[PDB]
Motif scaffolding. Structure first.
Motif, short mmCIF file in Angstrom:
data_model
loop_
_atom_site.label_atom_id
_atom_site.label_comp_id
_atom_site.label_asym_id
_atom_site.label_seq_id
_atom_site.Cartn_x
_atom_site.Cartn_y
_atom_site.Cartn_z
N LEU A 164 -5.05 5.64 -6.70
CA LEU A 164 -6.40 5.85 -6.25
C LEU A 164 -6.94 4.52 -5.80
O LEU A 164 -7.89 4.45 -5.01
CB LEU A 164 -7.33 6.31 -7.40
CG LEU A 164 -6.87 7.59 -8.13
CD1 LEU A 164 -7.73 7.83 -9.39
CD2 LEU A 164 -6.87 8.83 -7.22
N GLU A 165 -6.31 3.42 -6.27
CA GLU A 165 -6.60 2.07 -5.89
C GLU A 165 -5.68 1.67 -4.77
O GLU A 165 -5.87 0.63 -4.15
CB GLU A 165 -6.37 1.11 -7.08
CG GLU A 165 -7.31 1.40 -8.26
CD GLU A 165 -7.01 0.52 -9.47
OE1 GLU A 165 -7.81 0.58 -10.44
OE2 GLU A 165 -5.98 -0.21 -9.46
N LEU A 166 -4.67 2.52 -4.47
CA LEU A 166 -3.72 2.31 -3.41
C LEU A 166 -4.34 2.79 -2.13
O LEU A 166 -4.09 2.23 -1.06
CB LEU A 166 -2.42 3.11 -3.67
CG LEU A 166 -1.28 2.90 -2.64
CD1 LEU A 166 -0.78 1.45 -2.59
CD2 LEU A 166 -0.13 3.88 -2.93
N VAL A 167 -5.21 3.82 -2.24
CA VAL A 167 -5.94 4.37 -1.12
C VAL A 167 -7.32 3.76 -1.13
O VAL A 167 -8.12 4.03 -0.23
CB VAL A 167 -6.03 5.89 -1.17
CG1 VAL A 167 -4.60 6.46 -1.13
CG2 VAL A 167 -6.80 6.38 -2.42
N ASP A 168 -7.59 2.89 -2.14
CA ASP A 168 -8.74 2.03 -2.27
C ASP A 168 -9.93 2.81 -2.75
O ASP A 168 -10.47 3.66 -2.04
CB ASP A 168 -9.10 1.19 -1.02
CG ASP A 168 -7.86 0.44 -0.52
OD1 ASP A 168 -7.31 -0.38 -1.30
OD2 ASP A 168 -7.44 0.69 0.64
N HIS A 212 -6.33 14.39 -4.62
CA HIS A 212 -6.20 15.19 -3.43
C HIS A 212 -7.56 15.61 -2.93
O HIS A 212 -7.65 16.48 -2.07
CB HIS A 212 -5.40 16.46 -3.79
CG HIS A 212 -4.96 17.29 -2.61
ND1 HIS A 212 -4.07 16.77 -1.68
CD2 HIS A 212 -5.34 18.55 -2.26
CE1 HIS A 212 -3.93 17.74 -0.80
NE2 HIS A 212 -4.67 18.83 -1.10
N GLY A 213 -8.64 14.98 -3.42
CA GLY A 213 -10.00 15.38 -3.13
C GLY A 213 -10.74 14.27 -2.47
O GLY A 213 -11.75 14.51 -1.81
N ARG A 238 -5.76 9.31 7.77
CA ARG A 238 -5.04 10.56 7.60
C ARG A 238 -3.55 10.39 7.52
O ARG A 238 -2.91 10.85 6.58
CB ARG A 238 -5.38 11.56 8.73
CG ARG A 238 -5.02 13.03 8.44
CD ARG A 238 -5.63 13.96 9.50
NE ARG A 238 -5.55 15.39 9.05
CZ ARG A 238 -6.39 16.36 9.53
NH1 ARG A 238 -7.30 16.08 10.51
NH2 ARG A 238 -6.34 17.62 9.02
N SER A 239 -2.97 9.69 8.53
CA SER A 239 -1.57 9.37 8.62
C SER A 239 -1.06 8.56 7.45
O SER A 239 0.01 8.84 6.93
CB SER A 239 -1.26 8.56 9.90
OG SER A 239 -1.64 9.29 11.06
N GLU A 240 -1.85 7.55 7.01
CA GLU A 240 -1.50 6.66 5.92
C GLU A 240 -1.90 7.23 4.58
O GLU A 240 -2.09 6.49 3.62
CB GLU A 240 -2.22 5.30 6.08
CG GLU A 240 -1.81 4.56 7.37
CD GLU A 240 -2.68 3.32 7.52
OE1 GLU A 240 -2.13 2.19 7.46
OE2 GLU A 240 -3.92 3.48 7.71
N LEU A 241 -1.99 8.56 4.48
CA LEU A 241 -2.31 9.28 3.27
C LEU A 241 -1.27 10.35 3.17
O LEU A 241 -0.97 10.81 2.07
CB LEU A 241 -3.70 9.96 3.29
CG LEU A 241 -4.89 8.98 3.17
CD1 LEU A 241 -6.21 9.68 3.52
CD2 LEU A 241 -4.94 8.30 1.79
N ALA A 287 1.79 8.79 2.29
CA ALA A 287 1.68 8.44 0.90
C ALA A 287 1.79 9.69 0.07
O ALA A 287 2.02 9.62 -1.14
CB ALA A 287 0.33 7.77 0.59
N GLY A 288 1.68 10.88 0.72
CA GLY A 288 1.89 12.16 0.09
C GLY A 288 0.72 12.64 -0.72
O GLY A 288 0.87 13.59 -1.48
N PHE A 289 -0.45 11.97 -0.63
CA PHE A 289 -1.56 12.23 -1.51
C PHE A 289 -2.65 13.03 -0.84
O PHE A 289 -3.56 13.48 -1.52
CB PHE A 289 -2.20 10.93 -2.06
CG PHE A 289 -1.20 10.16 -2.90
CD1 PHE A 289 -0.96 8.80 -2.63
CD2 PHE A 289 -0.50 10.78 -3.96
CE1 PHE A 289 -0.02 8.09 -3.37
CE2 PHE A 289 0.43 10.06 -4.71
CZ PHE A 289 0.68 8.71 -4.41
N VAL A 290 -2.54 13.28 0.49
CA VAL A 290 -3.38 14.24 1.18
C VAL A 290 -2.52 15.46 1.45
O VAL A 290 -3.00 16.48 1.94
CB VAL A 290 -3.99 13.67 2.45
CG1 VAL A 290 -2.96 13.57 3.60
CG2 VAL A 290 -5.25 14.46 2.85
#
Lengths: 129, 116, 100, 91, 117, 58, 178, 103
Positions: free
Chosen positions: A51-55, A80-81, A94-97, A100-103
């Motif tokens: 969650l700190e990886l996606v900031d 995922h929210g 979007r692409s960089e999520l 990352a498999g988290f979206v």
RNA sequence: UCGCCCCUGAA
RNA sequence: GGCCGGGAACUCAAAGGAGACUGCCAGUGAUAAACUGGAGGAAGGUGGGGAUGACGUCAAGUCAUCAUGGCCCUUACGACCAGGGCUACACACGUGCUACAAUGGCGCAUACAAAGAGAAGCGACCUCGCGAGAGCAAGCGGACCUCAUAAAGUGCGUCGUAGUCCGGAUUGGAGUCUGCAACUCGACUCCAUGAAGUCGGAAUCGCUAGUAAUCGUGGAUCAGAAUGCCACGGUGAAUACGU
RNA sequence: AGAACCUUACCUGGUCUUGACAUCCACGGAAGUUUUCAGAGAUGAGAAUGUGCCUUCGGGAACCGUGAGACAGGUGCUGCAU
């Protein structure tokens, strides 16, 4: 009506409201901090990291209302929210999520017990000679 | 029941179904598959008299698969009968002709008003 | 279960209707079910004991259209093989095979 | 006994015996089919012939059989090991 | 101390050590200790000149050790002298429960071995 | 066995049920037994017409 | 018989290493599918190592494990042309797995209190090859380098060699190994 | 929240029956009452059995059942003099439960 | 390459 | 305190749709199908799981669910009742469950569930009981109320590798409940007694991912008996060169 | 898909014989209700009380007991009759 920016968090029997409030603040889940809703656990610390990886929290303040399902599962739906509420701003996000498999919803989740099986793929043993 | 009553008058066995299937395929049906248990002639062997004509897939979920049974109770034993008529082939009878409800397409979901 | 085995149970449910009334509360709360009011007497003894077979204890549930106390499904009044048969033709409404 | 809910069962097939065993005493060991009988200290010291589906067999009941069913103090079955009875029981 | 029971073991908490002086199990240990204000978060190697006094005092108020161990078995033998089911089956090495003798009852009859059928 | 007779949802939402009724909490059992009993006598005492199938609607 | 690629596991970064390599070292130290109880021992033993040895947080495991892993594992298969079971030079990914596994196995050969203290002291002796988990290495790698007959199944293979250009000595096999 | 004053319990097994029923009656429910309440789906009360498929032996294969019993509500709010209509006179049973009360 | 046998009958 | 109004946005429910088809991009492949990467997307290449289990073979099983050809019993082999036997037993085998422990036990405090169930029922509340439970009683045929307090887990206290603070069998006594009545042949509880076992040969079996593993929960049958079956969620892997 | 009795087919004993359960035929009694004794109950013999539906008022209809047969019942035997 809201005043927020929304992203839908459905993972593993835990469904989550996730409301981004503009401006820097602190993450708030159910009028508590993150590490207070998920407590002092060892597990909780590990799932803080993506969650700190996606900031998280640097221009962000939130209010979250997750309920039902597991402990890890709850945190999963948050994960995922906020990703679904972050892909809205830019499609480069979007692409960089998704890379990352988290979206990407983790569709893995408990499979039914079926007849003739001990468990969900476990079955009886043989030694009947 | 038509061909079953026939067996109970001790006339036709093998031949029973055959007549009733030239009938059934002439008008109506889209393939029939009959099963009849052989017991004829006072023979004491378990047998299966199985005759189809036209197509009967058993696994079609968009067709009217008919199925009923009868049984004779002759002095030759008991003769089970099974008649499977594939009346539909692309049209259901409860996968077609029904009314669902909702999507009512109204942007307002009515609420009580006033304030207190 | 055979006709005869069935027959037994009929008569027991006959007696049920002649020994559950005032005779219901008597066997239940008044003279049993966590002591009694002041009783537990030779009164209680005679009255409870002699209608042995009006008890639901003495009655073992089974289907009325095929019998057998095993494979029984009380809730819809069905038993083993006579579930499937009916259900396939749709003669038990809304009963269908698992698809979840 | 193995257990009791709160207390024992006087039994109605024992009721008739007690009331006529204070008017004539024993007069033949008391033929009682029921094994659900439990006796008073006023009914001890008698040959209560409880059944077991095999025979009514007398038990010269004691004070330690008060509050206890009398079935347990009689043979409940027939069995034998691989030995004779003159120094052991297996019945 | 020496107490009514056997000699005290040491290097164990009071609740612990009390179970090893028999006629006193889990409950009865801590139950005595609680009553007389004795701490059970301290050892018998950490025993005090307070706790030692009430030690002997309290154990004399209950039937424990050899005395208890007598009484109990006298009633196992009571039933044996009555010819009881529960009685006689205990000298055949057999349970008095719903417990199977077909496959189980190898506590009663000890470890399984091939022997006469 | 050799044929397991697949018809358990071919008469579901693929073709109509042949005995459509509803029952409440303590009525389940009753409604079941009563229906089937009638049909036995019914089908037997009619044989002068060619029965397509009895159905009931309760 | 096997169709398409094997599965890949995407696993989380550690909250004290950021690694997925030393997340796989929590995974080996899981029992009964509990990552919670696993993570305890991990950090408890990291500290034990740091005190009893010099090293670093990425040398308390890493370096120690690079002295337990062989570069050849000998697997099984009946065929060999001598009824031999062939050496297999293992991929760098499978190197990891071997050493990691063995260090946890080594702590079930110990009874030196906790489980942290066990594997910790073991890993401290495992970087200078004076442990007992580095002696497991000395049988897998000892064997493999002292005896070889390669992955060829000698009789079957020899026929194939002969057909291609004429040989009896080792080369690629043109014909069937069936 | 907001509370309704008329509640009707439409209850049948199949959704291919319950929603045929709902559409015929929530139509009329529009002009009934002083404010409309549409049909609340509610979570399904569900049953499901497993019964042995064979007359003798076996445990490898048993017949697997389900049987969702859906519970729709029709609903109105605010009682009027025309509540009588859509309640009982225009909603009748046929193998679908009809509640003839306001609960 | 790792030897290795033996199996009453009509559907 | 979603506890009250308000707001239907959101989650949620569950009816109806949108969607995935090698459809599209590149290579590979006879320019064929297809295969391998790519993109978009929640998801790619039978997406995952059900239903789906053919025509048949095994004179396979089942006359004991039920049906039925022949056969047999007829002041009975039929029928009804009380007692006993099904839970014998010196053993053997099959299928499970519980341990042999500190990744743990016990004590404290603490985190969140899902899916079902229910007026022969579950029963909040308050009272008492060490407890099981009993008394008092509201509510509930219900996204109402109750079963329900989820449990592993977690933060602390301890114990220290001992057959023990591990483990729990056995039996006795004392109690509970459900029943007309719990003696062989009910379950639960209380206290005591405290087992074997320090982690299992030859051998043999399951499993490629939310699976294994492990932890609880519910359901049916049920007056009253789950380590079983059936179902529900929690936490949650290792390994796969290669055939 | 829980075997305390019952369940239960099994055993030992009590007990019945067109019968516990069916239709039909003949007779009486509407079925029942609350209680007594003996017995282990099964039952067997009573003591009081009930007169619905129709009637020609007897009789029947449901229904109960008994009698008599044609029968009934059988988880009795053959899955190499089905």
């Amino acid at each position: 009506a809201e005043n927020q920016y929304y992203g839908t968090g459905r993972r593993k029997s835990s469904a989550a409201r996730v409301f981004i409030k503009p401006g820097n603040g602190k993450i708030v889940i159910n009028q508590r901090s993150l590490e207070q809703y998920f407590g002092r656990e060892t597990a909780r610390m590990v799932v803080r990291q993506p969650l700190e990886l996606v900031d998280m929290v640097e221009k962000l303040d939130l209010y979250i209302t997750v309920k039902g399902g597991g402990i890890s599962g709850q945190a999963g739906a948050i994960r995922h929210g906020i990703t679904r509420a972050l892909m809205e701003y830019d499609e480069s996000l979007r692409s960089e999520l998704r890379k990352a498999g988290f979206v990407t919803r983790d569709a893995r989740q408990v499979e039914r017990k079926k007849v003739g099986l001990r468990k969900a793929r476990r079955r009886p043993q043989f030694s009947k000679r | 029941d038509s061909i079953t009553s026939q067996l109970e008058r001790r006339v036709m066995f093998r031949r029973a179904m055959k007549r009733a299937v030239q009938n059934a395929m002439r008008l109506g049906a889209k393939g029939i598959k009959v099963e009849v248990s052989g017991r004829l002639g006072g023979a004491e062997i378990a047998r299966t008299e199985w005759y189809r004509e036209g197509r009967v897939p058993l696994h079609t979920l968009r067709a009217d698969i008919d199925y009923n049974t009868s049984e004779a109770h002759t002095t030759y034993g008991v003769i089970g009968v099974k008649v499977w008529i594939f009346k539909g082939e692309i049209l259901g009878g409860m996968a077609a002709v029904e009314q669902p409800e909702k999507p009512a397409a109204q942007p307002k979901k009515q609420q009580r008003k006033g304030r207190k | 279960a055979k006709q005869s085995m069935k027959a037994r149970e009929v008569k027991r449910v006959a007696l049920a209707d002649k020994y559950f009334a005032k005779r219901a509360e008597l066997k239940a709360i008044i003279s049993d079910v966590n002591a009694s009011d002041e009783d537990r007497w030779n009164a209680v003894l005679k009255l409870q004991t002699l209608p042995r077979d009006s008890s639901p204890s003495r009655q073992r549930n089974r289907c009325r259209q095929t019998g057998r106390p095993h494979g029984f499904l009380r809730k819809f009044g069905l038993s083993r093989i006579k579930v499937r048969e009916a259900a396939m033709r749709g003669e038990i409404p809304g009963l269908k095979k698992a698809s979840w | 006994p193995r257990s009791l809910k709160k207390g024992p069962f006087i039994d109605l097939h024992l009721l008739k015996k007690v009331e006529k065993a204070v008017e004539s005493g024993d007069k033949k060991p008391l033929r009682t089919w029921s094994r659900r009988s439990t006796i008073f200290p006023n009914m001890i010291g008698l040959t209560i012939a409880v059944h077991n589906g095999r025979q009514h067999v007398p038990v010269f009941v004691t004070d330690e059989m008060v509050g206890h069913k009398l079935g347990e103090f009689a043979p409940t079955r027939t069995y034998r090991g691989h030995a004779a009875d003159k120094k052991a029981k297996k019945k | 101390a020496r107490i009514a029971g056997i000699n005290i073991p040491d290097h164990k908490h009071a609740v612990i050590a009390l179970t090893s002086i028999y006629g006193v199990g889990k409950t009865r240990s801590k139950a005595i200790l609680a009553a007389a204000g004795i701490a059970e978060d301290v050892k018998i190697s950490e025993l005090s000149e307070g706790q030692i006094d009430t030690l002997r005092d309290e154990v004399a108020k209950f039937v424990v050790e050899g005395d208890l161990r007598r009484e109990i078995s006298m009633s196992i033998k009571r039933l044996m002298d009555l010819g009881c089911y529960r009685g006689l089956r205990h000298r055949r090495g057999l349970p008095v429960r719903g417990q199977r003798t077909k496959t189980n009852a190898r506590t009663r009859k000890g470890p399984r071995k091939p022997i006469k059928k | 066995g050799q044929k397991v007779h697949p018809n358990g949802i071919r008469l579901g939402i693929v073709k109509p049920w042949n005995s459509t009724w509803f029952a409440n909490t303590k009525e389940f059992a009753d409604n079941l037994d009563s229906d089937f009993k009638v049909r036995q006598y019914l089908t037997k005492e009619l044989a002068k017409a060619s029965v397509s199938r009895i159905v009931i609607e309760r | 018989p096997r169709r398409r690629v094997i599965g890949q596991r995407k696993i989380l970064p550690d909250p004290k290493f950021g690694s997925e390599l030393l997340a796989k070292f929590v995974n080996i130290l899981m029992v009964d599918g509990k990552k919670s109880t696993a993570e305890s021992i991990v950090y408890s033993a990291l500290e034990t190592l740091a005190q009893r040895s010099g090293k670093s947080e990425l040398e308390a495991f890493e370096v120690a494990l690079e002295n337990v892993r062989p570069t050849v594992e000998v697997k099984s298969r009946r065929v060999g042309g001598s009824t031999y079971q062939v050496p297999v030079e293992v991929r760098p990914v499978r190197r990891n797995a071997l050493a990691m596994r063995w260090i946890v196995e080594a702590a079930r050969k110990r009874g030196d209190k906790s489980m942290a203290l066990r594997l910790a002291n073991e890993l401290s002796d495992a970087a200078e090859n004076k442990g007992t988990a580095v002696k497991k290495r000395e049988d897998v790698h000892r064997m493999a380098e002292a005896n070889k007959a390669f992955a060829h199944y000698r009789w079957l293979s020899l026929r194939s060699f002969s057909h291609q250009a004429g040989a009896s000595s080792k080369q690629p096999a043109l014909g069937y190994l069936n | 929240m907001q509370n309704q004053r008329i509640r009707i319990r439409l209850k049948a097994f199949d959704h291919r029956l319950i929603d045929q029923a709902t559409a015929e009656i929530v139509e009329t429910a529009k002009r009934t009452g002083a404010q409309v309440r549409g049909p609340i789906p509610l979570p399904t009360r569900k049953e499901r059995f497993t019964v042995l498929i064979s007359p003798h032996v076996n445990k490898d294969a048993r017949d697997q059942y389900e049987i969702r019993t859906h519970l729709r509500l029709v609903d109105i709010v605010e009682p009027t003099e025309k509540t009588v209509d859509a309640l009982m006179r225009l909603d009748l049973a046929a193998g679908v439960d009809v509640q003839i009360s306001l609960g």
